Scaffold this active site. Structure first.
Site, short mmCIF file in Angstrom:
data_model
loop_
_atom_site.label_atom_id
_atom_site.label_comp_id
_atom_site.label_asym_id
_atom_site.label_seq_id
_atom_site.Cartn_x
_atom_site.Cartn_y
_atom_site.Cartn_z
CD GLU A 152 10.75 36.67 51.25
OE1 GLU A 152 10.25 36.22 50.23
OE2 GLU A 152 11.68 37.59 51.20
CG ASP A 196 16.29 35.55 51.00
OD1 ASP A 196 16.16 34.72 50.10
OD2 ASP A 196 15.33 36.39 51.26
C1 LIG Z 1 12.30 43.44 46.44
C2 LIG Z 1 11.34 43.33 47.46
C3 LIG Z 1 11.50 42.28 48.36
C4 LIG Z 1 12.52 41.36 48.18
C5 LIG Z 1 12.59 40.28 49.16
N1 LIG Z 1 12.98 38.96 48.55
C6 LIG Z 1 13.96 38.18 48.99
C7 LIG Z 1 13.93 37.02 48.31
N2 LIG Z 1 12.89 37.09 47.41
C8 LIG Z 1 12.31 38.26 47.61
C9 LIG Z 1 13.43 41.52 47.19
C10 LIG Z 1 13.37 42.59 46.29
ZN LIG Z 2 12.20 35.69 46.18
#
Ligand SMILES: c1ccc(Cn2ccnc2)cc1
Ligand SMILES: [Zn+2]
Length: 309
Positions: A152, A196
């Site tokens: 991810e 998440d």
């Molecule tokens: C900015 C861009 C993308 C994310 C996605 N994300 C979710 C968990 N760690 C990263 C969060 C902030």
């Molecule tokens: Zn993250």
């Protein structure tokens, strides 16, 4: 379509907080950047834990190699489908990789991001195993799927190409595989609930998608009910987590490749993010255990009500 108070207190009583913490969470709290030994070991741990469930889940890897800023890297999504014969499924998802940081600091283990999400899915599957098993034996029409996505996180900077390696691949893969009635495995996803950024104190969640607000309202109702039933800790007010109204902000995440293909999504992510987000302090000691177990109870009731368990 809510549980009677009796079904509910029994369901909550099937959870084992020490099991969640020690058997499912603690082993994940290692560096697990894509292609690393730690990532491989966590992948094998998830696979073996899922295969041990007595209900007899179908468990498969989606391995692939992709170009990255670090050169070719091998990724592998873990796909667990309780009843592969079923027409459709509730899908619960999270990412198992940890974000790569450069050497020279305390290692980043992403406790909220997303070791706690991973551990919650394992605990739910184990706590409800007898009910899930019974449902599958009855050829229940909607099954359960758990996705543990790799890659991810960006490997070296966030954008449409250095992020979401696992979810982009798996959504394309599912689109290419026929399913009945389908017509592809993408249409078998009745709802995609992505967990998440869970496990910090004082999370806040909003409904990111009008299409799925009914399920967000169900989660809020279950929070209120469990509060009123004296089942939530460190929860001194009836609604704390599930907030009404416009979201704080949207967050690019593993649901995007599915959303773009027409899958209904509920994004269960704290916004604002945990205070420790993307710092080395996102560790076990900074988790708030009562909140983790509150979320696990909310989710266990949600799952039992959604699937009629
Ligand atoms: C900015 C861009 C993308 C994310 C996605 N994300 C979710 C968990 N760690 C990263 C969060 C902030
Ligand atoms: Zn993250």
């Amino acid at each position: 379509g809510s549980l009677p108070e009796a079904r509910l207190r029994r369901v909550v009583g099937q959870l084992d907080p020490q099991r969640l913490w020690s058997t499912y969470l603690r082993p994940l709290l290692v560096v697990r950047t894509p292609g690393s030994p730690g990532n491989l070991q966590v992948r094998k741990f998830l696979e073996a834990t899922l295969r041990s469930l007595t209900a007899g889940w179908h468990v498969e890897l989606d391995p692939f190699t992709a170009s990255t800023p670090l050169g070719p890297v091998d990724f592998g999504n873990v796909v667990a489908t309780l009843d592969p014969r079923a027409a459709r499924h509730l899908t619960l998802a999270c990412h198992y990789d940890s974000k790569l940081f450069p050497p020279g600091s305390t290692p980043f283990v992403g406790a909220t991001d997303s070791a706690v999400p991973c551990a919650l899915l394992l605990e739910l599957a184990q706590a409800l195993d007898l009910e899930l098993s019974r449902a599958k034996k009855q050829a229940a029409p909607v099954t359960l799927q758990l996705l543990f996505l790799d890659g991810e996180e960006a490997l070296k900077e966030w954008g449409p190409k250095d992020s979401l390696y696992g979810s982009r691949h798996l959504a394309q893969l599912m689109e290419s595989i026929p399913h009945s009635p389908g017509p592809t495995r993408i249409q078998a996803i009745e709802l995609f609930m992505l967990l998440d950024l869970l496990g910090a104190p004082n999370p806040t969640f909003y409904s990111h998608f009008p299409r799925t607000v009914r399920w967000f309202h169900r989660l809020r109702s279950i929070e209120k009910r469990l509060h009123r039933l004296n089942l939530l800790q460190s929860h001194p007010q009836e609604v704390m987590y599930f907030q009404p109204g416009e979201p704080f902000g949207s967050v690019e995440d593993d649901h995007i490749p599915f959303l773009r293909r027409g899958v209904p999504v509920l994004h269960l992510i704290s916004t604002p993010f945990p205070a420790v987000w993307h710092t080395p302090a996102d560790t076990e000691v900074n988790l708030h255990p009562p909140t983790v177990h509150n979320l696990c109870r909310i989710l266990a009731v949600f799952l039992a009500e959604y699937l009629g368990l």
